[PDB]
Amino acid sequence: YGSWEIDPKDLTFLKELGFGVVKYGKWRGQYDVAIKMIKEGSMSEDEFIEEAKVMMNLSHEKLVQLYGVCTKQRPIFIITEYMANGCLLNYLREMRHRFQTQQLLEMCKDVCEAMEYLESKQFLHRDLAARNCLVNDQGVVKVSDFGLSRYVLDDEYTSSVGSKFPVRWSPPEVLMYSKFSSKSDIWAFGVLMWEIYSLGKMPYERFTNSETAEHIAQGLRLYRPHLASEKVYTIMYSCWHEKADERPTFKILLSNILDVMDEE
Ligand SMILES: Nc1ncnc2c1c(-c1ccc(Oc3ccccc3)cc1)cn2C1CCCC1
Question: What is the CA(218)–ligand 1 centre distance, in A?
Answer without folding.
Answer: 36
